[PDB]
Structure formats: C-alpha cells, structure tokens
Design a protein around this nucleic acid. Structure first.
Ligand code: NI
Ligand code: NI
Length: 57
DNA sequence: AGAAAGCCATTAGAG
DNA sequence: TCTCTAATGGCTTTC
C-alpha cells in the first residue's frame, strides 16, 4: 500500500526543494519529524523530485 | 572498507 | 480509463 501526501506535506517539501535539491542528515531528520513522515520517505520524495526536476531541466 | 546515499527504470495504487 | 507519484529494486557513487 501507498500513503497519499497532504497539500501541506507536499507544499512544505517543494518549498524546501526550492533552496537545495539535496538534503543533509540533520535536516532530513528535522523534516521527517515536522511532516510526520519517515526519514526514508523524505529521501525517496527527493529522489523522485530530483528526477522530475531532471525532465524539466 | 562498507554502511549510506544516490541514480535510474519500473511498477502499482490512489482518486 | 487515465494521471501522477509513492514506492521498489538493482545497480553505482559518495563518505
Ligand atoms: Ni528563491
Ligand atoms: Ni566498496
């Protein structure tokens, strides 16, 4: 099964991605707690978002 | 070194 | 039926 992300979670992440397309371990834990997601989800979201940003270039 | 993070292709589920 | 993206898996890369 797959969880669906709220607007707030997706908005707060996209806002983060605006500043740096990669995350540090300290920040990655911070974000996972604030959005009530796992460290793994945050990593994966950025993997996908970086791939999505690649197709837009 | 080898754990941890990435890249990339691919899949599958939510709505 | 169709779209988008969470999630996966098998590699390579970074530290
Ligand atoms: Ni700006
Ligand atoms: Ni090695």
């Amino acid at each position: 099964g797959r969880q669906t992300y709220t607007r707030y979670q997706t908005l707060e992440l996209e806002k983060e991605f605006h500043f740096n397309r990669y995350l540090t371990r300290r920040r990655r834990i911070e974000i996972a707690h604030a959005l009530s997601l796992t460290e793994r989800q945050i990593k994966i979201w950025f993997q996908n978002r970086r791939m999505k940003w690649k197709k837009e270039n």
